[PDB]
Amino acid sequence: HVMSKHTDFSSEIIGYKAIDGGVTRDIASTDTCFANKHADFDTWFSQRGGSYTNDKACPLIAAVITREVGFVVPGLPGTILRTTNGDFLHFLPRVFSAVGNICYTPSKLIEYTDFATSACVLAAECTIFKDASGKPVPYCYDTNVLEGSVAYESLRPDTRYVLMDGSIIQFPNTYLEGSVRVVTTFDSEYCRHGTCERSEAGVCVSTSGRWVLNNDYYRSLPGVFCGVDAVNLLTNMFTPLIQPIGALDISASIVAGGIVAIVVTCLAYY
Amino acid sequence: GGVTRDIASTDTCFANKHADFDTWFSQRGGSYTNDKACPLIAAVITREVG
Amino acid sequence: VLAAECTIFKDASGKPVPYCYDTNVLEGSVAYESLRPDTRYVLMDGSIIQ
Amino acid sequence: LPGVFCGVDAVNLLTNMFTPLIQPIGALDISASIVAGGIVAIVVTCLAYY
Amino acid sequence: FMRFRRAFGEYSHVVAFNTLLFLMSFTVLCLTPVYSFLPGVYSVIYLYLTFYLTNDVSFLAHIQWMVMFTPLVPFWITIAYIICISTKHFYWFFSNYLKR
Amino acid sequence: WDLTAFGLVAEWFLAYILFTRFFYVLGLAAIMQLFFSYFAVHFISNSWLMWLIINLVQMAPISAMVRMYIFFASFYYVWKSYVHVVDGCNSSTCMMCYK
Amino acid sequence: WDLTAFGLVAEWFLAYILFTRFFYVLGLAAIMQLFFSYFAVHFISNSWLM
């Protein structure tokens, strides 16, 4: 099969977004290959001076549309529509004019610029999990999308959840969400979409909505504070004000101090 | 050993019967392996059952 | 970042296309202002400016 | 180089402006009298008055 | 101690405190690599304690502290130390050559 | 990775290279501190002086004390070398013989 | 390039002509310089000889 170009619903489209690794991301001007189904995207990319080669092993192109088009498939971002000729299409519906890359936290919706450094947990409206009996069970943010689905807000932290494809999700408990976040962790590893990480128990505070876990890697990152105890956080955040920047504190310079003492001791006797 | 006792996160094996115990024990940061030789589990219910 | 008032670039098809700060000084040219940032451009000798 | 400031974001750049202030003394130009002037006034006020 | 006082004349008092402070600073520097809290709080305590000494040993103590602890202390601690040392002369200079 | 143990071993080796008469007391203190960690509670009862002595012995930071002995021995060896090179000695008990 | 690389090799070769007992110190230092360039930047804090 060879992909074809279609121009249906062109007047309802404001822009285009790329889907890479199952997660929507912004389009760079230097990207070289895409999977495309629209002829207008050629003009959209030529106006910015870009060129590309079409291949199936490259991120797909999806268009932001102001009209409800297609239906919802669990585990896939946006909506999927099949043309009269059998070709599939992808679109990004919206409710308000503020449109961007949108991902789903277990309780709230937050827009992001990059998946790697955001609070994203899931990127699909509906997700399906394997129950205790080994059978698939549907879940959705809104239960009206599919009958029998369970709301995302009913989920709880520190509980192991397995999707029907074998993936594992584990997110820690939080007490504040938004521009500033505070998190609590146990002595166990936590995993999210595509990445799992090991962390120790404690509490962390972040000045940004970036993903934070209690380990040395996130500890070294700027704007992140962590502590082994509730009160130890203040000591940790106040330590750098008197502690030097690094390991420049070489103790070999005490020879000069010892020389002054030896010199004065000899001089007094003489 | 025929005696009921409190539960702590240090223990590592139990004989689980109730399904919700798997979710309750995870919230305390503990992990366990199911073996019938380890002490059993009981649930507190207000309703008169059994 | 620009060496001269008028320059010449290569389009996506490889044809040479003249550019300058002002279009009025050279008929058929395209102003520098249309050049979007964070975009790769190439000249006659393969020089790259972004 | 002097006069150049950098950071990950707007907030991080604002914090990195004070990085030389927690640096050893022998790591700055002779024109470091600016930081001395900015330190001594704050210190003397905050102590002597308050 | 009597034998020590037999020699060194009048300067035994200056020598004793100079040796004791050097030994204390050497111990603090030896405990530095594990306990990172020491360089700041110990310097602050030393600055506080140096007031209860005679000027003859105070000058030596200041010289030793500036020679030894300078390369491993934040800049603001040093500037505060300098301001606190030099206020007693800044007052005199301002009174005698600037004040009204 | 962690290499604190390797650094401690290297510091101990360098201390052993700089052998002096005062290395034996440091070794005795270190071995006593290691020994008191295992038994400890078996023979500590009453006699608050004994408890104070045990607490003082256990809390000694030998690992942070070896580096001070290093500096103390370095100056002594430098002084001995300076005396030997320029001035000499008459005592035959010195180990300067075999050179 | 020739002039930018042959000079260092010539200097290294000439260094062996003026042989001395301290040549091994420089030989070990050369290995140390390259070793902690593709490795190291690790091994955390503590100790001072290393």
XYZ file of C-alpha atoms in Angstrom:
669
model
C 0.000 0.000 0.000
C 1.132 3.537 -0.862
C -0.085 6.582 1.046
C -2.195 9.157 -0.786
C -3.058 12.815 -0.230
C -6.514 14.161 0.628
C -7.890 17.668 1.075
C -11.158 17.088 2.970
C -11.917 19.429 5.893
C -9.125 21.810 4.835
C -11.035 24.987 5.760
C -11.506 23.790 9.359
C -7.762 23.355 10.050
C -5.697 25.992 11.844
C -2.345 24.187 11.993
C -0.487 20.888 12.064
C 1.291 18.818 14.704
C 3.601 15.810 14.542
C 3.143 12.489 16.344
C 6.372 10.754 17.357
C 6.602 7.696 19.587
C 2.863 7.817 20.213
C 3.192 11.293 21.757
C 2.331 14.542 19.997
C 5.209 17.001 19.653
C 5.979 20.261 17.888
C 7.334 20.246 14.333
C 10.949 21.300 13.804
C 12.129 23.026 10.639
C 15.070 20.616 10.213
C 13.133 17.334 10.423
C 13.784 15.275 7.303
C 11.074 12.602 7.019
C 7.361 12.315 7.787
C 4.311 10.218 7.028
C 1.805 12.536 5.367
C -1.773 12.254 4.117
C -2.510 15.907 3.250
C -1.531 18.001 0.240
C -1.944 21.299 2.109
C 0.872 20.278 4.458
C 3.200 20.545 1.460
C 2.392 24.257 1.144
C 2.515 24.626 4.938
C 6.066 23.239 4.968
C 7.196 25.029 1.793
C 6.155 28.421 3.182
C 8.714 27.776 5.946
C 11.337 26.554 3.468
C 11.312 22.895 4.467
C 11.716 19.716 2.441
C 11.053 16.098 3.358
C 10.769 12.541 2.053
C 7.679 10.393 2.631
C 8.153 7.077 4.442
C 6.089 4.866 6.737
C 8.836 4.653 9.398
C 8.649 8.388 10.191
C 6.425 10.473 12.490
C 2.894 11.003 11.203
C 1.328 14.387 10.501
C -1.855 15.413 12.310
C -3.915 18.567 11.821
C -5.549 20.708 14.503
C -9.206 21.115 13.521
C -11.998 23.218 15.031
C -14.613 20.550 14.227
C -15.367 17.190 15.828
C -14.173 14.693 13.207
C -13.751 10.945 13.576
C -14.077 8.810 16.693
C -11.936 7.965 19.722
C -9.681 4.899 19.886
C -8.250 4.076 23.343
C -4.484 4.426 23.604
C -4.199 6.810 20.645
C -3.965 10.615 20.863
C -6.499 12.750 19.054
C -9.142 11.193 16.820
C -8.942 8.719 13.941
C -11.015 8.894 10.758
C -11.021 6.505 7.802
C -11.614 7.958 4.346
C -13.970 6.536 1.732
C -10.910 5.074 -0.034
C -9.730 3.277 3.118
C -6.967 5.713 4.077
C -6.812 6.749 7.730
C -6.610 10.321 9.015
C -5.676 11.948 12.316
C -6.956 15.171 13.873
C -6.729 17.123 17.133
C -10.106 18.421 18.374
C -10.252 21.267 20.867
C -12.719 23.025 23.151
C -11.093 26.465 23.510
C -8.960 28.573 21.179
C -5.855 27.921 23.313
C -4.566 24.810 21.526
C -1.267 23.023 22.077
C 0.279 19.675 22.954
C -2.075 18.236 25.577
C -1.364 15.299 27.878
C -3.394 13.716 30.669
C -2.356 13.485 34.301
C -4.252 10.968 36.480
C -6.487 13.803 37.722
C -6.028 16.955 35.591
C -5.136 18.110 32.080
C -1.907 20.056 31.515
C -0.485 21.382 28.254
C 3.208 20.847 27.585
C 5.977 21.860 25.196
C 8.115 18.718 25.600
C 7.098 15.292 26.892
C 10.509 14.522 28.416
C 10.384 17.426 30.906
C 6.681 17.660 31.752
C 4.186 16.249 34.245
C 2.648 14.042 31.542
C 1.551 10.537 32.511
C -0.808 9.636 29.659
C -1.536 11.182 26.266
C -4.831 9.460 25.367
C -8.425 10.359 26.173
C -9.199 6.693 26.899
C -6.887 3.968 28.170
C -7.486 0.266 28.763
C -6.009 -1.728 31.654
C -5.711 -5.398 32.573
C -7.710 -6.252 35.693
C -6.880 -8.705 38.477
C -8.457 -11.549 36.467
C -6.310 -10.928 33.384
C -9.029 -9.312 31.266
C -9.063 -5.862 29.629
C -11.024 -3.071 31.318
C -11.621 0.327 29.664
C -10.889 3.662 31.317
C -11.541 7.211 30.134
C -11.280 10.764 31.407
C -14.979 11.186 30.557
C -17.184 8.113 30.953
C -19.581 9.333 28.236
C -17.035 8.598 25.482
C -17.339 4.811 25.853
C -19.871 2.786 27.824
C -18.470 0.865 30.780
C -15.361 3.030 31.148
C -14.087 4.121 34.566
C -13.086 7.715 35.291
C -9.385 8.547 35.535
C -9.953 10.421 38.803
C -10.872 7.148 40.541
C -7.267 5.938 40.227
C -4.976 6.101 43.253
C -1.214 6.644 43.645
C 1.310 4.023 44.771
C -0.807 1.259 43.181
C 0.504 -0.977 40.406
C -1.501 -0.781 37.176
C -0.862 -2.827 34.035
C -2.268 -2.064 30.594
C -3.512 -4.746 28.216
C -0.226 -4.577 26.273
C 1.925 -5.225 29.359
C 3.048 -1.686 30.196
C 3.261 -0.635 33.848
C 2.266 2.722 35.344
C 3.257 3.899 38.829
C 2.924 7.521 39.924
C 3.656 9.038 43.348
C 1.273 10.995 45.542
C 1.195 14.779 45.191
C -0.123 17.615 47.344
C 0.162 20.620 44.993
C -0.083 20.881 41.206
C 0.467 23.774 38.834
C 3.445 26.081 38.413
C 4.935 24.688 41.646
C 4.712 21.057 42.719
C 5.399 19.050 45.870
C 5.727 15.261 45.735
C 6.195 12.368 48.148
C 7.813 9.042 47.327
C 8.394 5.609 48.837
C 11.346 3.209 48.676
C 10.211 1.761 45.359
C 10.570 2.502 41.667
C 7.968 4.507 39.754
C 7.243 4.247 36.044
C 5.380 6.400 33.537
C 4.753 6.268 29.799
C 7.922 5.006 28.123
C 10.287 5.544 31.074
C 10.757 3.900 34.470
C 12.936 5.320 37.241
C 14.155 4.205 40.656
C 13.769 6.582 43.588
C 14.054 6.642 47.372
C 11.512 7.781 49.942
C 11.409 11.478 50.751
C 9.835 14.778 49.739
C 10.783 17.060 46.854
C 9.815 20.607 45.886
C 10.075 21.990 42.350
C 9.753 25.567 41.115
C 8.455 24.308 37.744
C 5.961 21.710 36.574
C 8.739 19.402 35.400
C 8.815 15.750 36.431
C 10.643 15.257 39.730
C 11.788 12.140 41.571
C 13.976 11.705 44.646
C 17.387 10.770 43.243
C 20.782 12.299 42.529
C 19.919 13.068 38.891
C 16.963 15.324 39.702
C 18.836 16.580 42.774
C 21.609 17.988 40.557
C 19.094 19.723 38.274
C 18.547 23.436 38.975
C 15.325 24.560 40.616
C 14.769 21.217 42.369
C 14.899 20.735 46.133
C 14.649 17.419 47.964
C 15.123 16.116 51.480
C 15.142 12.802 53.296
C 12.864 14.269 55.992
C 10.233 16.991 56.197
C 12.469 19.337 58.194
C 15.742 18.360 56.480
C 14.564 20.190 53.344
C 15.182 23.602 54.921
C 18.697 22.580 55.962
C 19.411 21.234 52.472
C 18.175 24.415 50.772
C 20.088 26.686 53.176
C 23.351 24.711 53.029
C 24.650 26.118 49.679
C 24.638 29.665 51.107
C 27.688 28.780 53.248
C 28.919 25.667 51.436
C 31.158 26.307 48.381
C 30.100 25.531 44.811
C 32.130 22.350 44.391
C 35.220 20.401 45.381
C 37.580 23.371 44.991
C 38.258 23.195 48.760
C 41.772 21.760 48.607
C 43.159 21.203 52.113
C 46.817 21.113 50.994
C 47.200 24.870 51.589
C 47.629 24.402 55.365
C 51.380 24.250 54.736
C 51.432 28.051 54.467
C 49.606 28.379 57.796
C 52.029 25.983 59.448
C 54.968 27.963 58.061
C 53.806 31.180 59.755
C 53.572 29.397 63.108
C 57.010 27.800 62.682
C 58.519 31.123 61.590
C 57.091 33.046 64.541
C 58.052 30.306 67.021
C 61.659 30.339 65.798
C 61.798 34.144 65.631
C 60.537 34.600 69.193
C 63.211 32.260 70.575
C 65.973 33.861 68.501
C 0.883 -18.414 65.513
C -2.768 -18.340 66.542
C -2.411 -14.709 67.667
C -3.550 -11.583 65.837
C -1.021 -8.757 65.594
C -0.546 -5.406 63.898
C 1.010 -5.052 60.446
C 4.199 -3.190 59.562
C 5.965 -2.404 56.296
C 8.970 -4.550 57.298
C 7.160 -7.858 56.708
C 7.682 -9.442 53.301
C 5.284 -12.395 52.864
C 1.639 -13.131 53.637
C -1.157 -15.536 52.749
C -3.496 -13.154 50.948
C -7.212 -13.845 50.580
C -8.752 -10.401 50.115
C -8.071 -8.576 46.851
C -8.222 -5.055 48.308
C -5.325 -5.916 50.635
C -3.049 -5.784 47.586
C -3.990 -2.118 47.128
C -4.002 -1.275 50.845
C -0.526 -2.690 51.501
C 0.966 -0.929 48.470
C 0.057 2.503 49.872
C 2.454 1.894 52.795
C 5.386 1.254 50.442
C 5.607 -2.463 51.163
C 6.091 -5.360 48.770
C 5.396 -9.018 49.489
C 5.568 -12.478 47.936
C 2.575 -14.790 48.325
C 3.397 -17.945 50.294
C 0.875 -19.993 52.265
C 3.411 -20.738 55.022
C 3.475 -17.046 56.005
C 0.928 -15.561 58.439
C -2.608 -15.078 57.149
C -4.595 -11.852 56.774
C -7.920 -10.770 58.269
C -10.181 -7.825 57.456
C -12.141 -5.632 59.859
C -15.823 -5.352 58.914
C -18.556 -3.681 60.960
C -21.276 -5.849 59.403
C -21.903 -9.172 61.130
C -20.669 -11.826 58.692
C -19.817 -15.476 59.243
C 25.455 37.545 10.547
C 25.208 38.886 6.984
C 28.365 39.747 5.056
C 26.886 42.017 2.374
C 23.771 44.045 1.632
C 22.705 41.666 -1.156
C 23.337 37.921 -1.147
C 22.399 34.882 -3.230
C 20.981 31.608 -1.892
C 19.881 28.208 -3.175
C 16.226 27.191 -3.055
C 14.861 23.726 -2.286
C 15.355 22.709 -5.939
C 18.935 24.018 -6.080
C 18.247 27.007 -8.329
C 20.026 30.238 -7.330
C 17.731 32.887 -5.858
C 18.960 36.450 -5.192
C 18.302 38.169 -1.869
C 18.898 41.659 -0.515
C 17.882 44.038 2.254
C 15.729 46.055 -0.165
C 13.950 44.681 -3.222
C 13.920 48.048 -5.020
C 17.676 47.944 -5.691
C 17.493 44.659 -7.647
C 14.445 43.609 -9.656
C 13.251 40.065 -9.021
C 14.857 39.801 -5.580
C 13.309 38.926 -2.214
C 13.818 40.929 0.968
C 15.825 39.595 3.908
C 12.833 40.124 6.215
C 11.057 37.060 4.789
C 13.839 34.801 6.128
C 12.363 32.954 9.098
C 14.673 32.198 12.048
C 15.845 28.702 12.978
C 15.923 27.721 9.300
C 18.837 26.351 7.293
C 19.988 28.293 4.234
C 22.743 27.515 1.733
C 24.718 29.701 -0.683
C 26.637 29.060 -3.900
C 29.716 27.624 -2.161
C 27.774 25.580 0.407
C 28.048 28.074 3.266
C 25.331 27.572 5.875
C 23.699 30.375 7.861
C 21.136 29.912 10.630
C 33.239 36.745 29.452
C 32.113 39.859 31.355
C 28.675 41.232 30.557
C 27.234 37.868 29.488
C 24.458 36.175 31.455
C 22.945 32.772 30.747
C 20.442 30.357 32.214
C 18.071 27.508 31.502
C 14.968 29.718 31.724
C 13.907 33.181 32.859
C 13.815 32.190 36.541
C 17.073 30.212 36.398
C 18.891 33.101 34.706
C 17.771 35.463 37.477
C 19.293 33.118 40.083
C 22.515 32.524 38.128
C 23.270 36.265 38.169
C 24.379 35.883 41.803
C 26.618 32.861 41.137
C 29.921 34.817 41.498
C 28.708 36.029 44.908
C 29.213 32.541 46.405
C 32.597 32.082 44.640
C 36.033 32.326 46.303
C 37.515 35.814 46.313
C 40.417 35.075 43.979
C 38.125 34.201 41.075
C 37.077 37.606 39.716
C 38.483 40.687 38.002
C 40.075 43.591 39.867
C 36.856 45.541 39.118
C 35.113 43.361 41.731
C 34.578 46.512 43.836
C 30.979 46.515 42.582
C 30.114 43.378 44.555
C 31.896 44.793 47.619
C 29.808 47.957 47.372
C 26.647 45.907 46.966
C 27.520 43.719 49.970
C 28.799 46.216 52.530
C 25.847 48.626 52.355
C 23.295 45.843 52.840
C 25.332 44.305 55.663
C 25.901 47.569 57.535
C 22.264 48.652 57.240
C 20.721 45.287 58.154
C 23.015 45.017 61.160
C 23.416 48.532 62.561
C 19.810 49.668 62.212
C 17.571 46.626 62.468
C 54.913 24.388 81.937
C 57.421 25.921 84.357
C 60.260 24.795 82.086
C 58.450 26.314 79.094
C 57.968 29.584 81.002
C 61.695 29.579 81.798
C 62.421 30.260 78.121
C 60.725 32.419 75.456
C 60.819 35.389 77.832
C 57.760 37.630 77.713
C 56.525 36.181 74.404
C 55.430 32.782 75.769
C 51.896 34.149 76.145
C 51.826 35.158 72.470
C 53.335 31.829 71.389
C 50.872 29.673 73.348
C 47.647 31.070 71.880
C 49.178 31.221 68.397
C 50.013 27.511 68.620
C 46.599 26.604 70.065
C 44.685 28.438 67.330
C 46.867 26.829 64.653
C 46.180 23.391 66.135
C 42.424 24.044 66.255
C 42.423 25.240 62.639
C 44.448 22.179 61.617
C 41.901 19.895 63.293
C 39.020 21.714 61.582
C 40.741 21.410 58.196
C 41.310 17.700 58.851
C 37.605 17.196 59.596
C 36.590 19.121 56.451
C 36.335 16.337 53.795
C 33.404 14.559 55.501
C 31.659 17.378 57.401
C 31.014 20.172 54.908
C 29.229 22.305 57.512
C 32.451 23.246 59.310
C 34.071 25.882 57.015
C 31.243 28.384 57.512
C 30.022 27.888 61.072
C 33.545 27.437 62.448
C 34.667 30.637 60.716
C 31.690 32.496 62.206
C 32.461 31.116 65.677
C 36.121 32.088 65.254
C 35.149 35.637 64.266
C 32.878 35.858 67.309
C 35.543 34.474 69.653
C 38.428 36.627 68.400
C 36.994 39.639 70.258
C 37.968 38.208 73.672
C 41.724 38.394 73.039
C 44.552 40.905 73.272
C 45.495 42.859 70.152
C 48.992 41.338 70.151
C 47.590 37.860 69.525
C 44.545 39.253 67.689
C 46.720 40.475 64.809
C 48.369 37.056 64.466
C 44.971 35.350 64.653
C 43.557 37.576 61.902
C 46.606 37.003 59.688
C 46.420 33.229 60.180
C 42.669 33.120 59.518
C 43.033 35.193 56.347
C 45.949 33.072 55.096
C 44.359 29.698 55.807
C 40.574 29.825 55.387
C 40.371 32.278 52.453
C 40.517 29.871 49.457
C 37.632 27.697 50.744
C 35.058 30.215 52.042
C 32.262 32.132 50.253
C 33.002 35.718 49.256
C 30.277 37.328 51.371
C 31.655 35.772 54.570
C 35.043 37.342 53.816
C 33.512 40.729 53.006
C 31.493 40.656 56.242
C 34.657 39.756 58.165
C 36.521 42.670 56.565
C 33.671 45.107 57.261
C 33.426 44.016 60.900
C 37.197 44.347 61.351
C 37.425 47.745 59.627
C 34.358 49.476 61.113
C 36.401 50.537 64.161
C 38.730 52.515 61.855
C 36.024 53.671 59.438
C 34.290 55.394 62.357
C 37.494 57.218 63.320
C 38.252 58.244 59.729
C 34.710 59.513 59.125
C 34.687 61.425 62.416
C 38.091 63.030 61.885
C 38.036 63.859 58.158
C 34.457 63.792 56.826
C 31.900 64.508 59.554
C 30.465 68.010 59.048
C 30.558 4.660 41.422
C 31.873 4.867 44.988
C 35.612 4.913 45.743
C 35.756 6.204 49.332
C 37.154 2.867 50.511
C 39.891 3.012 47.866
C 40.845 6.507 49.013
C 40.975 5.399 52.647
C 43.139 2.414 51.677
C 45.497 4.676 49.718
C 45.765 7.076 52.664
C 46.516 4.173 55.017
C 49.157 2.853 52.608
C 50.833 6.261 52.390
C 50.754 6.493 56.192
C 52.437 3.087 56.386
C 55.092 4.339 53.951
C 55.806 7.251 56.306
C 56.671 4.966 59.218
C 57.458 6.556 62.582
C 57.502 5.469 66.212
C 54.042 7.009 66.706
C 52.265 4.796 64.149
C 51.768 2.011 66.700
C 49.575 4.081 69.024
C 47.381 5.129 66.083
C 47.093 1.492 65.024
C 46.180 0.485 68.573
C 43.510 3.192 68.721
C 42.062 2.083 65.376
C 41.998 -1.599 66.340
C 40.428 -0.791 69.725
C 37.753 1.305 68.007
C 37.020 -1.562 65.602
C 36.953 -4.094 68.454
C 34.588 -2.122 70.693
C 31.928 -2.096 67.956
C 31.289 -5.848 68.115
C 31.111 -6.720 71.825
C 30.430 -3.342 73.473
C 27.395 -4.167 75.607
C 28.841 -7.353 77.117
C 31.110 -5.680 79.698
C 29.712 -2.171 80.279
C 27.825 -1.856 83.571
C 28.016 0.772 86.318
C 31.269 2.733 86.686
C 30.228 5.833 84.716
C 33.942 6.520 84.197
C 34.151 3.298 82.174
C 31.150 4.392 80.099
C 32.765 7.788 79.479
C 36.009 6.103 78.400
C 34.166 3.742 76.040
C 32.191 6.617 74.515
C 35.364 8.675 74.047
C 37.160 5.754 72.374
C 34.268 4.893 70.050
C 33.725 8.457 68.804
C 37.333 9.024 67.706
C 37.522 9.815 63.944
C 40.668 7.853 63.052
C 39.837 8.055 59.337
C 39.948 11.870 59.607
C 42.932 11.763 61.983
C 45.383 9.827 59.786
C 45.713 12.791 57.416
C 46.888 15.023 60.280
C 49.551 12.471 61.219
C 50.593 12.583 57.555
C 51.292 16.318 57.765
C 52.977 15.939 61.158
C 55.356 13.271 59.836
C 56.093 15.101 56.570
C 57.684 18.088 58.319
C 59.680 15.832 60.655
C 61.066 13.871 57.704
C 61.879 17.087 55.814
C 63.752 18.407 58.858
C 65.652 15.131 59.260
C 66.614 15.133 55.573
C 67.777 18.752 55.799
C 69.911 17.943 58.851
C 71.400 14.863 57.181
C 72.227 16.486 53.831
C 73.987 19.654 55.051
C 75.159 19.014 58.674
C 75.515 15.300 59.399
C 75.423 13.398 62.666
C 77.879 11.560 64.899
C 75.579 9.026 66.589
C 76.006 5.501 65.221
C 72.507 4.454 66.331
C 70.986 6.324 63.371
C 69.888 4.332 60.332
C 71.987 6.534 58.041
C 74.667 3.802 58.042
C 73.814 1.551 55.091
C 73.932 4.448 52.598
C 46.943 18.358 9.405
C 50.699 18.108 8.907
C 51.978 21.289 10.556
C 49.427 21.087 13.384
C 50.254 17.482 14.348
C 53.774 16.658 13.152
C 55.231 19.251 15.520
C 53.889 17.509 18.621
C 55.163 14.135 17.389
C 58.582 15.648 16.662
C 58.698 17.175 20.151
C 57.744 13.824 21.693
C 60.470 12.064 19.697
C 63.046 14.689 20.696
C 62.016 14.248 24.338
C 63.366 10.685 24.264
C 66.781 11.944 23.111
C 67.241 13.873 26.375
C 66.433 10.824 28.476
C 66.417 11.013 32.272
C 65.064 9.112 35.257
C 62.069 11.473 35.408
C 60.865 10.548 31.900
C 58.613 7.867 33.397
C 56.800 10.537 35.436
C 55.835 12.352 32.233
C 54.977 9.023 30.614
C 52.559 8.195 33.429
C 51.145 11.737 33.407
C 50.391 11.400 29.689
C 48.427 8.198 30.346
C 46.617 9.829 33.274
C 45.606 12.854 31.188
C 43.953 10.692 28.523
C 42.464 8.188 30.978
C 40.337 10.731 32.848
C 38.876 12.223 29.666
C 36.732 9.333 28.408
C 36.035 8.171 31.978
C 36.139 9.468 35.561
C 34.000 12.584 36.284
C 32.658 10.244 38.981
C 33.611 8.489 42.248
C 31.797 11.141 44.346
C 33.223 13.019 47.337
C 35.356 12.060 50.383
C 39.123 11.416 50.638
C 41.719 13.955 49.491
C 44.714 12.083 48.011
C 42.727 10.899 44.980
